[PDB]
Amino acid sequence: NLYFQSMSVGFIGAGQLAFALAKGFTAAGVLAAHKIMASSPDMDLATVSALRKMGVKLTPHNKETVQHSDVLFLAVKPHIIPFILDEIGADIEDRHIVVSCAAGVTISSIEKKLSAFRPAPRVIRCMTNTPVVVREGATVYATGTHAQVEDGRLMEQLLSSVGFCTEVEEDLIDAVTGLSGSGPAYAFTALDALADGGVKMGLPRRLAVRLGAQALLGAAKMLLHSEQHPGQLKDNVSSPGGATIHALHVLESGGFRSLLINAVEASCIRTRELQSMAD
Amino acid sequence: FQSMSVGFIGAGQLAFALAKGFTAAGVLAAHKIMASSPDMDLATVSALRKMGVKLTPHNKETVQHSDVLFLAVKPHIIPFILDEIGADIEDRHIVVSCAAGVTISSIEKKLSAFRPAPRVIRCMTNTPVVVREGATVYATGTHAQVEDGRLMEQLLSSVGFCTEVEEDLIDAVTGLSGSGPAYAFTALDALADGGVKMGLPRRLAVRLGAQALLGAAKMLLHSEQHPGQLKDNVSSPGGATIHALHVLESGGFRSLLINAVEASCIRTRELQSMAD
Amino acid sequence: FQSMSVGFIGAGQLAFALAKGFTAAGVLAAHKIMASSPDMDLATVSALRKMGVKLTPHNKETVQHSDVLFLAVKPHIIPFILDEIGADIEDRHIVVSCAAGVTISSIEKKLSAFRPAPRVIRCMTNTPVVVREGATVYATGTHAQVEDGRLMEQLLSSVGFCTEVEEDLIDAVTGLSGSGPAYAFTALDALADGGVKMGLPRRLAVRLGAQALLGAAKMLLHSEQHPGQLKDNVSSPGGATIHALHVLESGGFRSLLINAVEASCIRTRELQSMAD
Amino acid sequence: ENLYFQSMSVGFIGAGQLAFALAKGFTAAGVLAAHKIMASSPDMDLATVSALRKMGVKLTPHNKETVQHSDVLFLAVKPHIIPFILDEIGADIEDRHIVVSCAAGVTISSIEKKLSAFRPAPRVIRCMTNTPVVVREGATVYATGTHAQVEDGRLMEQLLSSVGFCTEVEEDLIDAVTGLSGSGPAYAFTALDALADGGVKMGLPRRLAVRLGAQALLGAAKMLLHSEQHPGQLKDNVSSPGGATIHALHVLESGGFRSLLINAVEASCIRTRELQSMADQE
Amino acid sequence: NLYFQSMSVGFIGAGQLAFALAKGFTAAGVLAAHKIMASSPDMDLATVSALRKMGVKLTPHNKETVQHSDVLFLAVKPHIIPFILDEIGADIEDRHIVVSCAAGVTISSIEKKLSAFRPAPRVIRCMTNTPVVVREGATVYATGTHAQVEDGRLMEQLLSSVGFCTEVEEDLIDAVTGLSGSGPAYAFTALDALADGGVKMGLPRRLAVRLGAQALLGAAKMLLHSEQHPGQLKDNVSSPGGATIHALHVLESGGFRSLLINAVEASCIRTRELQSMAD
Ligand SMILES: Cc1c(C(=O)O)cccc1N1CCNC1=O
Ligand SMILES: Cc1c(C(=O)O)cccc1N1CCNC1=O
Ligand SMILES: Cc1c(C(=O)O)cccc1N1CCNC1=O
Ligand SMILES: Cc1c(C(=O)O)cccc1N1CCNC1=O
Ligand SMILES: Cc1c(C(=O)O)cccc1N1CCNC1=O
């Protein structure tokens, strides 16, 4: 029964992540779409057309987003952020909470830009992912220097309505990006391949995609609701001499585990290295 | 345009491909094209003569003939060309650089020492312009007029796909569609070897493999659907195609093509860093 | 021909592709085509209705409507189809099997029990017939008349390449151009991933990669030259393309495509051995 | 013939494998008298020195004697020895000399820099050849230095053409040539040894497998050199559908055969450059 | 100064191998092209058009080749041989020497077919390669049951005019096929790759192809004229610490030698397995 009656939300950027969050927030009922405004340099994006359908207010002008909004999501590419902050810095007021969703972009760099216009900008850095669109996102956030205690509690309330949300120290966020920020792409790749495997063995493609996705969904839910180690749940499904343990062996023979470690590491390192070139 | 005069500095594979595509398209008569080369014995130069293109060993004569000037020389030769003909660039000229990696900044810097406001366009095209199915991107320079970009798009659209991009995308485009045809020629040779291994005559295997690739690419271009969806559409359960897809996956087929785009892009950037 | 009536048993991806190509080509009006399927809710069936193709759940009605009868069902369904409609085959009928691996002998054996001298043609086509760039081979059966092979070649030539082959080549053709589009869709997805990794927007990367493959395939088809010679022509010394070719070679890129043709061909043969 | 009646005196500083291969080739060609060649080495106990002796080549431990004897002076020592050689006999190079460096990686510029401190216009040519000059089937490229006369390049081409293919290139190609045809015979010797092993594994006597593999490679190379055709086209022409040859080509592809030969040319070229960059820093 | 004045040669099959041998024999001067006849089911082959240019007599009918010829080369695909022998078996005379060039096809299978029509067919089995076209072929042959001593000496004289030729026991020929029969294809692949390597390092393609081919030609000639082991010649070119030994290492690291062993083995096994399916 959550609802932020006194809150206006703006998205600078109207891409995949802005659409997912707006759809999540509306589907949760915590915000009405008409209290959400999004701006984009390209008003012909398919995400823009969809936001219009939901009732979200659209404008080409980032300044109008800022003037309309209390909570301002920066949902542009990381290299776009300094240009955004240059453009609207003089429009940031005391009432604004600036929530940066950009991968790698530090609270320090955002506060430094905005402090040139007005001291004490209220900045929160977050890393979320697109499954907020089905209210099963995974979000972490870190509060900036001038964020009030009520600011983070409020953002946790909002982002908890679309998935898991928790506060972290900012120096964990690049690693979170490699795990749950990039995570859904790893899963989509895995589901495409599992479906290909089902088709090879004779399943219709539609059934194979549905079964694979359901298997992944249920296994993740099992882990989330269990106090048990994932290796323990693996043991419970691996019947002696059976089909599952034979398949696990061929995963191990290809170094399956190391590829996923490789992936989290690669996404995290890229995230840091993008920011370091920015700075 | 009709009154438009075009010149090529460099008369190698790319200049021939472009001149052949332009004249096949009808947008340009061969007599309105002139080309120069340090080597007037190249096969590409003899072919251009058969088509009716004017040839010269002197780059200055090509410049004086031309309105649109294509630089189709190797990237390391561009600075030398610019030094040799920079004093001959007029206000009427549009200089279109085709060299991999060579930046608009480096070209404008060289030419601006002879005359300010050089109209410079950078493009990355590929050799299939010779059959009017090229892939071309271009970026306009500091002093390029709006009509200059539209003239370029009109000309290059006649021999394939053409769109304007920001210049910082062009090295990646080089790795993808600039080098792309070579990946496809390698693949077509291998697919033909495979057909021959399984009993097909070579001439038939080459024709079938090439037709298969053309038709698939055309399908994707004419479809709104994802390439994996099209792959799904043609992968019958338990069948031959899905068995073959598996063996490609087992060799990391996808990663090799990603590697290739990356390597070509990185080499393109690296060559320019050595230039500057 | 104009008076020619065509039927499809099976209304999946291949039947739609063929009907769409045939009607786009102009050789066949949609109203002279009829299709049947055990599942009248498939997307392919709804699309065929929009085009104006007649639909039915009863294979017998398709047979009675048709002069040329395409069997576009899965290979394991062919024997069942033949048992169900074998008594409805007339002398006027030409039965064109599209099923991977299914031999003319097995089809003639089934049908000859109902009426002697069935006119049977086996082909291997592919889905790019939907954009009139298919690759098709066919072999004529024991009782196929000379005009039957020329009618088939005329029809299938309207939607792509078509040539007659000896039947023992068809399983290899399946591995090459039958499964070929799927290899190309996989490659185009990966090439797009590569362009995206190097900074390109996805929509642009897909378009450029697909255009690059189309143009290269068209170049080879229009050239008398070897694919390695065309590769040589586009591999500038020390440049980006030759660097990218090396990384493909280092992963055994060529061998993977050979593997794929072989695996699809072998699976095609293996399925038929299980049939018989 | 016309080179013979020029009665050139040739010197080699360095009496190793390349000096012996060139001396053998030149004398077999009839362009030089063995006793009109002089070679020097700090190590007079090398086997190649003993072979040169038997040929009739004059040998001396004194590099100055080789310089004074010579009209054309080949520098055939290893690359790191070249700057010490140029220090030692730089004062003895005369205006009449053509100095031909065969050392991998060593630039004309580095040689002229040393020699220019003595006489002002040293005539320098850089070449990359290979040991098959010994059977007059070498692959040679050369580049002419700042003060090399046009007649010097022509003379060099005439001489080296007597022992194989020879052509002028810009100097910036020579490190790559080194990785390809300078090191190339070693790749072929490795390949011939392995093909012979494969012959032996399948039941052939070693002597026959060596002969047949070598004849196959020789004939294939000659076919290519005499054909206006792409090597892939020649490959297509011999690969019968479904046959033994295309099956063998597949297993070469599956091991990345092509990439290993590219790796080899690259590794030899890069090493050649790396040794020069080390010398030019010092 | 060799010349077979009293010899007519026929080729059944007019493909790559027949053209190479006819061009080799004519270039050697041992046969005039007008004393050579070739037949082919396809008179539009590019090889057929070239044979016509040399002056070789062409006919669609294998029977005419047999009637014209003394020495009859079977230069068709192996699976074509039994059909050829069925077609012309009744036309084989006492004067004919039948030289089969087909990979894998045994003397026993040929003699069995031809003996049904007339006893004591004179059969020689050979394995040659296309470099006979430049008179640098590599040929081995085995004499059949009814071949006279003069028959093999004659075929060795003829085939020696276009390259190396020697008699072997028939059970070596499948292995020879894997080594020198398929050998030139291995070399063409290697030369394409070496040229690619030269181009990568900055050489024009034309120069790289010429240098690579010359290097291979000279090295093979060096080995043929030396009494020394190929490893010894390798040692003579591998200067300590130098460029060549660095390149040899990277060949070894990829298992270069084992790939060539793999190749000879694969071609030999395929050759045997084709014949075993024939029998
Ligand atoms: C670019 C990006 C990555 C990436 O680098 O792949 C990963 C997670 C989120 C984001 N997003 C989305 C919107 N703005 C961002 O930074
Ligand atoms: C050299 C080159 C590459 C490369 O580096 O492989 C790639 C694409 C285009 C070009 N061209 C063609 C003419 N001038 C260029 O720069
Ligand atoms: C099943 C199939 C394969 C395969 O086995 O992957 C390959 C090519 C065509 C076909 N089709 C389509 C319709 N009926 C068939 O047999
Ligand atoms: C050392 C060397 C290599 C190598 O580095 O392997 C390659 C080619 C030639 C030479 N030679 C021979 C005499 N002096 C040289 O530099
Ligand atoms: C088919 C073939 C192979 C092979 O199987 O690749 C190898 C060597 C020779 C032959 N030839 C040529 C003519 N008739 C033959 O058998």
Side-chain angles (χ1 to χ4, degrees), chain A residues 1-4 7-43 45-52 54-111 113-147 151-152 154-226 228-279, chain B residues 4-31 33-40 42-53 55-59 62-108 110-145 148-153 155-202 204-223 225-276, chain C residues 4-31 33-40 42-53 55-59 62-108 110-145 148-153 155-202 204-223 225-276, chain D residues 3-5 7-44 46-53 55-112 114-150 152-153 155-206 208-227 229-280, chain E residues 1-4 7-43 45-52 54-111 113-147 151-152 154-226 228-279:
Chain A
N1 289 317
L2 191 43
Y3 181 78
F4 309 94
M7 179 192 290
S8 287
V9 172
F11 291 91
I12 295 174
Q16 281 288 130
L17 201 65
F19 170 78
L21 286 171
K23 176 93 274 184
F25 291 154
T26 55
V30 300
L31 285 158
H34 70 81
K35 292 295 289 297
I36 304 173
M37 182 170 302
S39 45
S40 174
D42 185 357
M43 312 299 294
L45 296 178
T47 44
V48 174
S49 339
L51 291 161
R52 198 174 284 101
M54 323 173 22
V56 167
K57 302 171 113 277
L58 291 156
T59 170
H61 306 109
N62 292 330
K63 187 174 181 124
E64 280 171 13
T65 309
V66 179
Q67 293 179 335
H68 147 278
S69 310
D70 302 319
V71 175
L72 183 68
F73 285 93
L74 307 185
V76 292
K77 310 302 184 175
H79 63 276
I80 303 299
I81 293 270
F83 297 98
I84 292 303
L85 298 178
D86 287 338
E87 192 201 349
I88 51 78
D91 303 309
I92 296 302
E93 315 278 349
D94 298 339
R95 70 165 196 282
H96 283 113
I97 305 172
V98 183
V99 186
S100 178
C101 300
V105 174
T106 62
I107 292 170
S108 160
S109 78
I110 296 159
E111 294 182 347
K113 274 283 181 191
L114 293 172
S115 294
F117 297 96
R118 182 186 302 271
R122 295 152 73 189
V123 174
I124 295 178
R125 179 182 169 181
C126 106
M127 172 51 53
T128 187
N129 57 12
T130 55
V132 299
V133 75
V134 292
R135 304 179 63 191
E136 291 295 348
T139 306
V140 303
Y141 69 94
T143 53
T145 314
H146 320 289
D151 288 350
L154 178 70
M155 294 302 99
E156 182 156 339
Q157 290 179 38
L158 176 59
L159 294 160
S160 292
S161 73
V162 290
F164 168 79
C165 183
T166 197
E167 182 180 0
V168 298
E169 283 306 302
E170 189 189 6
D171 73 349
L172 300 192
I173 292 181
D174 295 339
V176 170
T177 305
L179 174 55
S180 55
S182 301
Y186 311 156
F188 298 142
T189 302
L191 287 165
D192 194 27
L194 285 163
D196 281 342
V199 169
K200 195 195 184 187
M201 304 321 290
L203 301 179
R205 169 68 63 162
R206 191 157 183 69
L207 180 66
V209 170
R210 174 84 179 80
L211 288 177
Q214 184 67 43
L216 181 59
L217 191 149
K221 190 179 185 192
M222 267 187 88
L223 187 62
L224 286 165
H225 284 54
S226 185
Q228 289 167 102
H229 193 277
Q232 185 63 60
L233 297 189
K234 186 186 73 68
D235 290 353
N236 298 344
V237 178
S238 304
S239 184
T244 299
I245 190 63
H246 273 75
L248 291 174
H249 188 187
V250 308
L251 291 179
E252 299 286 356
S253 291
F256 182 73
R257 297 167 175 268
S258 66
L259 302 186
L260 291 159
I261 301 167
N262 286 352
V264 174
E265 171 177 65
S267 168
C268 176
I269 290 175
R270 182 57 175 177
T271 296
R272 308 178 165 152
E273 97 177 356
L274 284 181
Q275 183 65 7
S276 301
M277 293 169 200
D279 296 331
Chain B
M4 189 166 64
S5 165
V6 174
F8 291 92
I9 299 183
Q13 295 283 338
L14 193 71
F16 171 80
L18 279 174
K20 187 161 188 211
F22 284 156
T23 58
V27 303
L28 222 52
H31 72 87
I33 307 179
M34 182 169 170
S36 59
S37 170
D39 183 349
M40 302 298 287
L42 289 170
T44 47
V45 167
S46 321
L48 289 157
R49 188 103 57 183
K50 309 245 198 175
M51 295 163 36
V53 180
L55 278 307
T56 183
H58 303 136
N59 291 328
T62 300
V63 174
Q64 298 175 341
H65 149 96
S66 309
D67 303 320
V68 177
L69 188 62
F70 286 90
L71 311 183
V73 299
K74 307 300 196 187
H76 62 271
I77 302 168
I78 293 277
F80 295 93
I81 292 312
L82 300 176
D83 289 330
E84 183 207 354
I85 56 86
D88 302 323
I89 298 297
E90 320 267 28
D91 317 288
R92 72 162 195 278
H93 276 126
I94 300 167
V95 183
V96 182
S97 175
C98 298
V102 178
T103 64
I104 291 168
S105 164
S106 70
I107 295 160
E108 291 181 354
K110 277 278 187 175
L111 294 179
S112 286
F114 297 95
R115 183 182 313 272
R119 299 150 74 179
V120 174
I121 290 175
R122 172 177 180 192
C123 80
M124 174 47 55
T125 190
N126 57 10
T127 58
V129 298
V130 72
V131 290
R132 303 187 56 200
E133 292 294 349
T136 305
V137 305
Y138 68 90
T140 60
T142 314
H143 318 285
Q145 316 172 351
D148 296 358
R150 286 200 297 272
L151 171 61
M152 252 275 325
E153 170 134 359
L155 190 55
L156 271 298
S157 280
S158 75
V159 298
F161 173 73
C162 185
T163 187
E164 184 181 2
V165 297
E166 285 292 334
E167 189 186 9
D168 61 22
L169 301 197
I170 293 182
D171 293 343
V173 171
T174 309
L176 174 58
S177 53
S179 300
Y183 314 154
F185 297 142
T186 303
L188 288 168
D189 194 25
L191 284 164
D193 283 340
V196 172
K197 189 196 196 186
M198 303 319 292
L200 298 184
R202 168 74 56 170
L204 178 61
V206 168
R207 178 77 162 96
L208 292 174
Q211 186 63 49
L213 254 61
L214 194 154
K218 195 183 183 199
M219 263 186 91
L220 189 53
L221 288 167
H222 284 58
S223 177
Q225 286 163 282
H226 195 273
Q229 182 63 68
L230 294 190
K231 188 210 60 164
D232 289 357
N233 294 347
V234 304
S235 298
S236 199
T241 300
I242 187 60
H243 278 69
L245 289 178
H246 191 188
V247 304
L248 294 175
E249 298 290 1
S250 294
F253 178 72
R254 296 167 175 264
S255 69
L256 299 186
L257 293 154
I258 298 175
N259 288 351
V261 176
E262 173 172 58
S264 166
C265 176
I266 288 177
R267 179 59 170 180
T268 296
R269 302 176 168 161
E270 167 187 29
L271 292 172
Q272 190 63 19
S273 295
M274 291 165 185
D276 306 332
Chain C
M4 189 166 64
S5 165
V6 174
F8 291 92
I9 299 183
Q13 295 283 338
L14 193 71
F16 171 80
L18 279 174
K20 187 161 188 211
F22 284 156
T23 58
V27 303
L28 222 52
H31 72 87
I33 307 179
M34 182 169 170
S36 59
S37 170
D39 183 349
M40 302 298 287
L42 289 170
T44 47
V45 167
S46 321
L48 289 157
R49 188 103 57 183
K50 309 245 198 175
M51 295 163 36
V53 180
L55 278 307
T56 183
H58 303 136
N59 291 328
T62 300
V63 174
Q64 298 175 341
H65 149 96
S66 309
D67 303 320
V68 177
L69 188 62
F70 286 90
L71 311 183
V73 299
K74 307 300 196 187
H76 62 271
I77 302 168
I78 293 277
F80 295 93
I81 292 312
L82 300 176
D83 289 330
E84 183 207 354
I85 56 86
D88 302 323
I89 298 297
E90 320 267 28
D91 317 288
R92 72 162 195 278
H93 276 126
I94 300 167
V95 183
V96 182
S97 175
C98 298
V102 178
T103 64
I104 291 168
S105 164
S106 70
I107 295 160
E108 291 181 354
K110 277 278 187 175
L111 294 179
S112 286
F114 297 95
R115 183 182 313 272
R119 299 150 74 179
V120 174
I121 290 175
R122 172 177 180 192
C123 80
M124 174 47 55
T125 190
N126 57 10
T127 58
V129 298
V130 72
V131 290
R132 303 187 56 200
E133 292 294 349
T136 305
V137 305
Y138 68 90
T140 60
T142 314
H143 318 285
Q145 316 172 351
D148 296 358
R150 286 200 297 272
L151 171 61
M152 252 275 325
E153 170 134 359
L155 190 55
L156 271 298
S157 280
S158 75
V159 298
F161 173 73
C162 185
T163 187
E164 184 181 2
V165 297
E166 285 292 334
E167 189 186 9
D168 61 22
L169 301 197
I170 293 182
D171 293 343
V173 171
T174 309
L176 174 58
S177 53
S179 300
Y183 314 154
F185 297 142
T186 303
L188 288 168
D189 194 25
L191 284 164
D193 283 340
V196 172
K197 189 196 196 186
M198 303 319 292
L200 298 184
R202 168 74 56 170
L204 178 61
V206 168
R207 178 77 162 96
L208 292 174
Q211 186 63 49
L213 254 61
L214 194 154
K218 195 183 183 199
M219 263 186 91
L220 189 53
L221 288 167
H222 284 58
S223 177
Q225 286 163 282
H226 195 273
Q229 182 63 68
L230 294 190
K231 188 210 60 164
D232 289 357
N233 294 347
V234 304
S235 298
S236 199
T241 300
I242 187 60
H243 278 69
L245 289 178
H246 191 188
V247 304
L248 294 175
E249 298 290 1
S250 294
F253 178 72
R254 296 167 175 264
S255 69
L256 299 186
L257 293 154
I258 298 175
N259 288 351
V261 176
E262 173 172 58
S264 166
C265 176
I266 288 177
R267 179 59 170 180
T268 296
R269 302 176 168 161
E270 167 187 29
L271 292 172
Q272 190 63 19
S273 295
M274 291 165 185
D276 306 332
Chain D
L3 241 164
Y4 169 77
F5 284 96
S7 43
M8 280 191 355
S9 312
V10 168
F12 294 90
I13 291 181
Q17 302 287 343
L18 190 59
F20 169 78
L22 286 166
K24 188 97 171 298
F26 287 149
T27 55
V31 302
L32 296 175
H35 57 260
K36 283 292 276 187
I37 306 173
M38 185 182 284
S40 49
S41 172
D43 182 14
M44 299 297 293
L46 295 164
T48 53
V49 171
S50 301
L52 289 161
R53 279 214 185 266
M55 271 180 67
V57 169
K58 312 289 199 180
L59 287 145
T60 171
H62 306 303
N63 288 327
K64 177 184 196 170
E65 285 178 42
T66 304
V67 176
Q68 286 183 337
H69 161 85
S70 298
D71 311 321
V72 172
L73 178 66
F74 286 93
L75 304 190
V77 292
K78 284 168 204 312
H80 61 278
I81 321 283
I82 289 281
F84 294 113
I85 294 307
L86 302 172
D87 289 332
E88 178 199 4
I89 47 76
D92 302 306
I93 303 295
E94 308 169 58
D95 297 357
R96 65 186 185 73
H97 280 123
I98 305 174
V99 178
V100 185
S101 181
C102 305
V106 174
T107 65
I108 292 167
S109 172
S110 74
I111 292 155
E112 288 177 353
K114 287 252 176 219
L115 293 184
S116 277
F118 303 97
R119 297 291 300 149
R123 293 148 71 191
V124 172
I125 289 167
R126 178 179 171 187
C127 89
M128 174 49 53
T129 187
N130 57 9
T131 63
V133 297
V134 72
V135 287
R136 298 179 69 194
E137 286 297 349
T140 304
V141 305
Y142 70 97
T144 59
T146 312
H147 316 285
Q149 292 296 100
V150 59
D152 296 341
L155 169 58
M156 170 80 179
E157 181 150 336
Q158 291 167 31
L159 182 63
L160 274 292
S161 292
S162 71
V163 296
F165 175 74
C166 179
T167 193
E168 189 183 351
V169 301
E170 292 296 317
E171 189 188 4
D172 60 24
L173 305 185
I174 293 187
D175 291 348
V177 170
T178 307
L180 174 56
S181 56
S183 296
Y187 315 155
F189 299 141
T190 302
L192 288 165
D193 193 29
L195 283 164
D197 283 346
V200 169
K201 188 191 182 187
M202 305 316 294
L204 299 182
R206 172 70 57 167
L208 177 67
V210 169
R211 184 88 176 252
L212 286 174
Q215 187 65 45
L217 295 210
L218 192 151
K222 188 181 182 186
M223 259 187 98
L224 185 54
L225 289 167
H226 288 48
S227 189
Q229 298 234 274
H230 194 276
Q233 183 67 57
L234 300 182
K235 169 209 117 227
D236 289 6
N237 296 345
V238 298
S239 294
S240 190
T245 298
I246 190 70
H247 277 69
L249 293 172
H250 188 185
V251 304
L252 293 174
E253 296 293 356
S254 294
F257 182 71
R258 296 168 176 266
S259 65
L260 304 184
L261 293 157
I262 303 163
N263 290 345
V265 174
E266 168 179 59
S268 167
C269 179
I270 289 187
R271 180 61 170 174
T272 295
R273 297 177 174 158
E274 157 188 25
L275 292 177
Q276 181 67 357
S277 308
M278 289 180 188
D280 281 341
Chain E
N1 289 317
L2 191 43
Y3 181 78
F4 309 94
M7 179 192 290
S8 287
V9 172
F11 291 91
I12 295 174
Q16 281 288 130
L17 201 65
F19 170 78
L21 286 171
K23 176 93 274 184
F25 291 154
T26 55
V30 300
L31 285 158
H34 70 81
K35 292 295 289 297
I36 304 173
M37 182 170 302
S39 45
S40 174
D42 185 357
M43 312 299 294
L45 296 178
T47 44
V48 174
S49 339
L51 291 161
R52 198 174 284 101
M54 323 173 22
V56 167
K57 302 171 113 277
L58 291 156
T59 170
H61 306 109
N62 292 330
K63 187 174 181 124
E64 280 171 13
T65 309
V66 179
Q67 293 179 335
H68 147 278
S69 310
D70 302 319
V71 175
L72 183 68
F73 285 93
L74 307 185
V76 292
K77 310 302 184 175
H79 63 276
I80 303 299
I81 293 270
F83 297 98
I84 292 303
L85 298 178
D86 287 338
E87 192 201 349
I88 51 78
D91 303 309
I92 296 302
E93 315 278 349
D94 298 339
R95 70 165 196 282
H96 283 113
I97 305 172
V98 183
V99 186
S100 178
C101 300
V105 174
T106 62
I107 292 170
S108 160
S109 78
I110 296 159
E111 294 182 347
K113 274 283 181 191
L114 293 172
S115 294
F117 297 96
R118 182 186 302 271
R122 295 152 73 189
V123 174
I124 295 178
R125 179 182 169 181
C126 106
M127 172 51 53
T128 187
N129 57 12
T130 55
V132 299
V133 75
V134 292
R135 304 179 63 191
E136 291 295 348
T139 306
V140 303
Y141 69 94
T143 53
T145 314
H146 320 289
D151 288 350
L154 178 70
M155 294 302 99
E156 182 156 339
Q157 290 179 38
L158 176 59
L159 294 160
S160 292
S161 73
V162 290
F164 168 79
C165 183
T166 197
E167 182 180 0
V168 298
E169 283 306 302
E170 189 189 6
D171 73 349
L172 300 192
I173 292 181
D174 295 339
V176 170
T177 305
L179 174 55
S180 55
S182 301
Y186 311 156
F188 298 142
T189 302
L191 287 165
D192 194 27
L194 285 163
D196 281 342
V199 169
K200 195 195 184 187
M201 304 321 290
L203 301 179
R205 169 68 63 162
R206 191 157 183 69
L207 180 66
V209 170
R210 174 84 179 80
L211 288 177
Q214 184 67 43
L216 181 59
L217 191 149
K221 190 179 185 192
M222 267 187 88
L223 187 62
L224 286 165
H225 284 54
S226 185
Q228 289 167 102
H229 193 277
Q232 185 63 60
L233 297 189
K234 186 186 73 68
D235 290 353
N236 298 344
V237 178
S238 304
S239 184
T244 299
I245 190 63
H246 273 75
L248 291 174
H249 188 187
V250 308
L251 291 179
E252 299 286 356
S253 291
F256 182 73
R257 297 167 175 268
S258 66
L259 302 186
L260 291 159
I261 301 167
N262 286 352
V264 174
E265 171 177 65
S267 168
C268 176
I269 290 175
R270 182 57 175 177
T271 296
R272 308 178 165 152
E273 97 177 356
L274 284 181
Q275 183 65 7
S276 301
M277 293 169 200
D279 296 331

